[PDB]
């Protein structure tokens, strides 16, 4: 078994809600964060969790630090329920949901402008849980679920109720794990993202290619270029709008043909930047008399 | 320091080239594979290498297994040059490039239908190299570069020359590392990929949405949907082609407006599958009398 | 090796910026301070670092103390990236830049009115870095770069956004180093400074020298006197403006000749003060009938 | 206490004077060098001495090496008087000043073409002396004063008197100190220096700026630019001489206005070089028809 | 690691320059010799350094022995700067460049007719430097650079200035290294040299070959013969100048055809000598009536 | 004594000859390779052997690896005769030469498609042999001579005779030596080589020099440039062919003067490349109207 840690990991922010925004006792739950190893998308532990099969938090002490002044006050209670199918979201009594919160071991009751810690209590046996995204049963792959309950109305410096929502802190983990059995573990968790939208150049000479240089991107990362344009009237003048762009080093072609007899808006470009964060592509137009702009999107895997 | 391993990693295939395809002594180099921790895109070690700053192969024994029968023969030589700026690609003598290959320590000389191993010789000091993609100088972040040289013409069962290229084996690592100083290490290495191209449905009723169910994808992975169509004549009949698709659960919109007065082909959809590998989206057309098909691409981060 | 410390060193102030002043995720970086031994110009460690070749922070724990009351609140995160070419200034996601901040080892997450410390994590080998100003590669001479990221909008006592910039604290180091190999290490870091601008006296008698005594300077420090005057009409009356000043003890002459046939405004004076912080110079004018004032600047090396 | 050393330090040269140049017995003293830690301006020890309060030479053995051949001869005597207010410069007998020199402990009597050493004798108590420039009393901050006396007329290869002064050797220290109580110790000892004098370019176009590139300076050091010109007749042709120079990166402006109605010759420029030792500044002239040259001085702190 | 030494190696001679030949303080540097293992072309250590990747001088004490009498005198200072990018060639003060020389550890100050030694101070870590010719950064492959500064004007037996340059000594190393990781290390350092120029014989009989025996060469070394002739008028008589020379044992042909219709002056001969230092070649002329001499050059790799 | 190894060294290839190509029993000897330390020109050991006087193989196990398939068969026998003047090349019986081969100790009898090793048996005394090229007697400087004898006709997959020669394997050493008494050992073994033949440019302007840039050479290696041209008719038009080329940095001149009154084709150029493998030279022609091409050869020491 490969023992890793201790490090930190950013889970979420927590939005303490106003006294008028709480209607049912199920509405008091501010965060419901699973503490599986594969449920913090983008952090250090979730990128590591898809390279072993099993894991076990030896000590995953959740750590709250506030972002709120010392002139507003509200009491929280914070626990880690080790039974991932027990659910406090269907308890109809507001005093019952907070007796259920303090009764859980390791719970810790704080004013929400104070840094306090909640440790995860390990199970008496040497039980390993599966990593990765969740299959059929949650009890194979979640060791705990982190809750925060609001027990008091959000008060201010004069004894009055704050009537607006207020993002109040951040939850940081401090983990220590035993991974085991290295498997590259498919159904990856890297979510792609539209990085930015930047348009092509407007060339002068018909049929002669030009080099367009885009700047301000990450150094030496592979991107994916998809064409998409917004609200262009290609029939405001004569000619056929034909745009074909290729990378000078990468792979793929983009064909933009706004001929209404045969219309083709397709293609993709795979190209990585240089060490400065730039890449260049050759754009050629058969009819350069048309000056309608055309954009393209930058798709990248961020985590 | 976190000691990891031992495991295996698939580097490349190796294409043993014919006797007529070798012209200069620089052409004998079959593979030039850097043995940095961040230069095997998609494997286990490269996914792990961007979560620590430094690394050191305590034992990275490269292991060749063949995929060629016992009736063709060719002698290889295989070494790991620990000086990543020394380059054998500019040596003009064919006998010099193979005396330079056997003189390197840890080199191993095999017939190419035989499984033989080449160990990486560590440096006498306790020197750590940086992970991640390479910056200015290669000697900060490459511990070795793996070469394979072809020293004999590719012969067959009767003593004659094979005149075609022949993929012959595969290179597997057996690594053992000391990582250190956990940093999430930006400029990620996850390259995105066009997964498959599948088109929208052809609905019957104008203005009433329908649910399109795409199957055969990975379970519980986040995708990115980009619109692109190929060679459609939207002016073969009357009407305005307006297609708007939204996910029922995810995020984003796709607008396909083939009005030649204002043309908008844009948008993206972020949506993840269910546990069966399917996801569904609501497609509505204002004018359903037009039966031109429209496609969309599936962008996903694969590693 | 000469082991020095522990002492303190003033790095910078940190200007926590308002919620409207943050546009891109790269704008959240408040300070980007290199923690090389030669990158704190004027402190104790940078004056010492140019008298040895190498250094290694055994413990350089950065220490934040606030200068802001307990009625405004904002959460910081603070880390020391040991890889001086990894750059978080080109990450396009605001949640990614703060997961990258907490994942770094030794990071520490605080409300910005609270004194918290961030230790520098040493590298597993015994690696020495060069001192002095940076040459070609930064990884030879920077052991870490200190960042501070703002993760929460700057809030006040009532839950409202502060709309102005607010200098909030100060960063103090607590260092402990092993220097080695004494070299006086050229390209010094002492920046000169215009100390103050004070003008000459207006003497009465032509051709007879007078002693001008300037007060209020540092005791027993060598200065440099350069002549410069502002907006004088020397042709408002007759005569030739000739001013020649020499120190009574130091070195150099200043010649001020406003003859429009041959104009000479040049010279410098090197003279040090006495133990009281004063020095005196002999000023003689050939034509004292002209009462245009003439100034001179005081150049001094401050650190 | 921080124990430093052993290293070397260049004190001075020593000019052995001729037999006709010695008139009084006080004239035999060749060098009178204080051996305080802050009295060798520019060396290694004086740059280090202003970063602690106290010091004590455990062994500061002064070391003479000659620069004179073996064909001229003269006997020296060399001692270190530990009482910095005892003065041998007011002893009227030439035989008394050399009995006073050999009687001092640690004195060493050599021919002046021979390398001999003089050790500093420490005081029987554990007495620390203050660093920095000298205040009221010298006995708080000087541990010794180094003398060299000439006891014999300067003779040559044939037994005749050399009648000219002759620089003969150099004095090198070999020190070993205990510093204590780190204080950054104001009234710094870095003396500024006119580096070189270089003039502006003569531009062609009026009102359009040009870039002047000065080369041959130290890499990555901050300078100070002061304007000063020598003997220019600005009324040899028509026009108003207006020169305004700014750095492209640094700080400050220089205004040169030779209008005799309002004359302004002022300003300073703070700018540092690049890694090649060059810096560039933008020079613009309102009236470029005047071709009088104008210079500027380069002020830099050298030690 | 293979520990080698101790042996000696001849670095250079050193030309002490006259008092009139020193203009700038950068001109005082007599030698600037890098002390890399691959920067003494022709010695023992540089021939050995291209057969391992790394090296570390455990003790490389530079040793000066003079070649000048005891009747001229000049003081040197000699140090080994361990930071190969620190450069004293851009320091504008002549007293600063010699305080920077004595402050370096291991420096040693001698009269230049005296044998003195300068040891190389090793770095506190176990750092190995690359061998071979220098790549991008010098700090990977130079452990030190050897300087010698002239601090005193070159004086003679009577106290007068020598006005001519004077080669004065020689610098010998005394090394002790740890090499590691045997690699044959391309881009070899063996520089070829025109050994001597000797011409062909003038044969009598047309079309009958003769044996030309060249003597006075190195025994059993492979040479390379290239044809080149100087100022021959081949049209002073009738006939066609055709000369073809082959070795009797070696490889290659030389064709000398001075036909102005088709002119061919080409070819090379590879042939090694016998154990006596001679080799013989067959020279045949089709038209022996022409008595113009023709030469050939002897190319050999000397180190 | 300096103990080196163990490493590998490429000796030769071995050409197994057909059944019809064997006539006399002396023709069965495939390789006759001396195992002196100075008889593998270009390898690691021969470059090291000319830097000590003596050597002794403690273990020089010769290692055969085949390059032939498993469908042809032939039996070899392989031994190392420690008596370098005993010669099996004058034994008239084919069965005697193979009884003499197996009787030698350390001999090893293999099918020629199988990797087998032959160890060198050391002599019972501690006898050192001289390095370098061989003088008068071979028994001072050869410890062994490696033979391979073919004992069986070369057969194929069906029991028939292969009638063509077939290069079959390669011989690799695995050495371990004690060198002694460091001497730089003259009559070097570096053989020079014509690298490539590339011609001059054809300039346009008479008398104005142009810069010719040759690419594709080894980085930072010193070359030697010799002029040689092939079959040029310089009298096809008017003018005098005068070509003079100099390096911009190196040493030497080439003069090409095709004046038939005084003809000079001579000169050499010594110039090294930059770090990219290129060098440039200035070519000037007095009469550029002549467009006959002229070549030059590149001489380099390869090992």
Numbering used by the authors:
A (entry chain A), B (entry chain A), C (entry chain A), D (entry chain A), E (entry chain A), F (entry chain A): 66 to 368
Manuscript text:
A major factor that limits the expansion of shrimp cultures is, however, infectious diseases from viruses, such as P. vannamei nodavirus (PvNV) and M. rosenbergii nodavirus (MrNV), which have inflicted heavy economic losses. The Nodaviridae genome comprises two single-stranded positive-sense RNA that encode the capsid protein for viral capsid assembly, the RNA polymerase for RNA replication, and the B2 protein for host RNA interference suppressor. While the shell domains (S-domains) of PvNV and MrNV contain conserved sequences of 62% identity, the protrusion domains (P-domains) and N-arms show low sequence identities of only 17% and 43%, respectively. In this work, we have determined the cryo-EM structures of T = 3 and T = 1 PvNV-LPs at atomic resolution, the crystal structures of the P-domains of PvNV and MrNV (PvNVPd and MrNVPd), and the crystal structure of the S-domain of PvNV (ΔN-ARM-PvNVSd) in the T = 1 subviral particle (SVP).
The structure of a smaller-sized T = 1 PvNV-LP particle was determined by cryo-EM at 3.7 Å resolution. The subunit A of the T = 3 PvNV-LP was used to assist in the building of a complete model for the T = 1 PvNV-LP. The final atomic model of a capsid protein in the T = 1 PvNV-LP includes residues 64–368 without the mostly structurally disordered N-terminal region (residues 1–63), and comprises a canonical viral jelly-roll S-domain with two four-stranded antiparallel β-sheets (BIDG and CHEF), a linker and a P-domain. Totally, 60 PvNV capsid proteins were structurally equivalent with the I2, I3, and I5 axes. A structural comparison of one subunit of T = 1 PvNV-LP and the subunit A of T = 3 PvNV-LP reveals RMSD < 0.2 Å. The 30 spikes on the outer surface are also readily discernible. They might be mainly involved in the homo-dimeric capsomere interactions, resulting in the A/A dimer with a bent conformation with angle ~144°, similar to the A/B dimer of T = 3 PvNV-LP. Although there is no extra density at the interface between two neighboring subunits of the T = 1 PvNV-LP, the high structural homology of the S-domains in the T = 3 and T = 1 PvNV-LPs suggests that the Ca2+-binding site is conserved. The T = 3 and T = 1 PvNV-LPs have the similar structures of the S-domain, linker, and P-domain, but the N-ARM and N-arm of T = 1 PvNV-LP are more flexible. In contrast with the T = 3 PvNV-LP, T = 1 PvNV-LP, with only A/A dimers, has a bent conformation and a smaller inner cavity, and would associate weakly with the RNA nucleotide, rendering free or partial viral genome encapsidation.
